[PDB]
């Protein structure tokens with residue numbers, strides 16, 4: 001099989017195995033969210049006549065899930081089995097001897113219902129209006145025990161039988177009907193939340209990415225897989241341009257999470273970043289002097305003194321992209337070809353002596369990315385600089401000046417821009433909470449036409465507990 005998408009997400013069986021340690025927390029929440037209506041009636045009891053009854057204020061007093069197991073059913077669903085969910089309900093039994101009025105006043109007995117259940121939830125994943133929706137219509141319950149215990153162990157003779165016959169049955173059906181409904185709601189609440197957080201991560205101000213599905217998610221016995229548009233949105237405008245082709249053969253099934261990114265995404269990124277006016281840098285006096293030092297060169301050297309030079313607190317440097325950067329995914333790395341305008345101004349007392357140069361050039365950099373210790377790291381594999389139009393805006397100019405300014409662009413400009421770049425993406429991910437998760441041995445892999453993120457993750461316990469508590 002083959003798929004049309006700009007971005008692809010693959011969650012494998014090892015990821016589901018780690019997430020299965022939290023299934024009980026979700027199932028517990030489902031029981032805790034359900035609304036059990038009162039069970040009332042009036043039947044003629046053996047030798048007693050009409051007895052009007054009611055099981056009121058049914059609340060859970062104890063819950064315990066023994067173990068859960070998850071299985072991927074190819075082309076069908078995600079099958080979760082929950083064994084031995086020990087439930088204890090409490091409430092009030094209220095009755096009256098309608099016909100046998102001689103038997104005294106109406107009663108109110110506090111009871112406990114001790115039940116053991118085995119569950120089977122088979123969740124189907126579908127594309128609903130761009131987003132993944134979850135539907136579990138195959139939700140099953142198997143009861144191991146369903147015992148009533150009344151305060152003081154009271155028994156007139158009609159209670160146990162009315163509970164064994166009649167009541168037992170309806171209660172089993174009320175429970176399944178509520179529990180399954182709640183599992184489906186919590187399940188969709190999670191899906192919705194995960195997708196909202198994923199869309200938040202892939203956005204900054206007027207820039208966002210359209211992660212709308214291209215088809216229903218894929219279920220194999222090895223993995224779960226979802227295919228996304230990946231079209232960039234700018235100021236609430238997007239274009240439904242034909243999608244690249246994804247091959248499920250390109251991805252593995254060993255790591256917990258595999259992310260596929262077409263190079264069109266990086267191209268579409270560069271376009272919006274350029275148009276939003278983000279691709280510019282400006283350095284003033286002190287900041288400019290600090291940058292030169294930061295790149296292993298002492299400020300009070302001779303070289304500096306002749307040109308940077310007149311007044312260090314008055315020196316200006318501006319870099320802006322002339323046109324949109326051309327990004328390409330290669331086996332060797334991410335290759336970025338950017339047409340830049342570097343402007344240098346070193347004002348002197350008399351505006352004649354000031355050195356004013358404008359370097360209009362094309363810089364090609366081959367980058368390699370890394371993530372570790374909750375930071376993004378960009379390293380330079382190779383580069384090429386071709387000056388298109390170097391210009392001097394004063395009589396204060398020579399070839400040695402042009403060389404010092406050009407060496408500055410190469411030896412300081414390239415490492416600093418990459419340094420600032422890594423900081424920005426690190427801040428974005430941090431602010432969007434990517435650092436909250438424990439990302440284990442991640443690998444950024446560049447290939448011809450695409451990039452690949454392969455990772456194992458440590459699911460953070462308390463954050464789910466927090467989210468689960470935050471419902472109504």
Ligand SMILES: CCCCC/C=C/C/C=C\CCCCCCCC(=O)OC[C@H](COP(=O)([O-])OCC[N+](C)(C)C)OC(=O)CCCCCCC/C=C\C/C=C/CCCCC
Pocket residue numbers: 201202203204207208265269270273277278279280281319320321325336338340417420421424425428429
């Ligand atoms: C764009 C990548 C290509 C970069 C290569 C460009 C070639 C170099 C060309 C010219 C050099 C001059 C400009 C470089 C210097 C500026 C570098 C920089 O400092 O910053 C890059 C810039 C934001 O500069 P600024 O003036 O707005 O802020 C300034 C920050 N200060 C307030 C602290 C001062 O532009 C951005 O970063 C744009 C990125 C925004 C991304 C947000 C969209 C959401 C998508 C992904 C992010 C989430 C991570 C998941 C990954 C999914 C894969 C897409």
Ligand SMILES: *[C@@H]1O[C@H](CO[C@@H]2O[C@@H](C)[C@@H](O)[C@@H](O)[C@@H]2O)[C@@H](O[C@@H]2O[C@H](CO)[C@@H](O[C@H]3O[C@H](CO)[C@@H](O)[C@H](O)[C@@H]3O)[C@H](O)[C@H]2NC(C)=O)[C@H](O)[C@H]1NC(C)=O
Pocket residue numbers: 392393394395396397398399402
């Ligand atoms: C930019 O700098 C030019 C000179 O600097 C250097 O020029 C190259 C040789 C090279 O080393 C390069 O790296 C540097 O940029 C300035 O050009 C000079 O301007 C002078 C004044 O106009 C000029 O002089 C005389 O030129 C003719 C012929 O001799 C006379 O008829 C005239 O009256 C001038 O007195 C000099 O020759 C000229 N040099 C060149 C190579 O053109 C240039 O003006 C300056 N730009 C700005 C905007 O000021």
Ligand SMILES: CCCCCCCC/C=C\CCCCCCCC(=O)O[C@H]1CC[C@@]2(C)C(=CC[C@H]3[C@@H]4CC[C@H]([C@H](C)CCCC(C)C)[C@@]4(C)CC[C@@H]32)C1
Pocket residue numbers: 283288291292317319334336338340342363365367368369371376378408409412413414416417418421425434439442443444451453455
């Ligand atoms: C004294 C100084 C004065 C002189 C004036 C200065 C003159 C300078 C002029 C020009 C300099 C221009 C040269 C620099 C060119 C830019 C080079 C340059 O660094 O370009 C890079 C920009 C970032 C990026 C798009 C890239 C490649 C890899 C991308 C990344 C791959 C994965 C990354 C995910 C966010 C991480 C997922 C991790 C997961 C949680 C496990 C992702 C998408 C982040 C962004 C990069 C190329």
Ligand SMILES: CCOC(=O)N1c2ccc(C(F)(F)F)cc2[C@@H](N(Cc2cc(C(F)(F)F)cc(C(F)(F)F)c2)C(=O)OC)C[C@H]1CC
Pocket residue numbers: 007008009010011125130131132133190191192194195196197198199201202211212213217218224225226228257259
């Ligand atoms: C940290 C917040 O983000 C996330 O947790 N993820 C994320 C991140 C990037 C992208 C990507 F690739 F498009 F850029 C998509 C997604 C999410 N996602 C896909 C997805 C896949 C399945 C799958 F495989 F099982 F079918 C199920 C679900 C969900 F939400 F229903 F549970 C979501 C997404 O946002 O889809 C629109 C899934 C999730 C994977 C860690």
Ligand SMILES: [Cl-]
Pocket residue numbers: 154155156
């Ligand atoms: Cl009694």
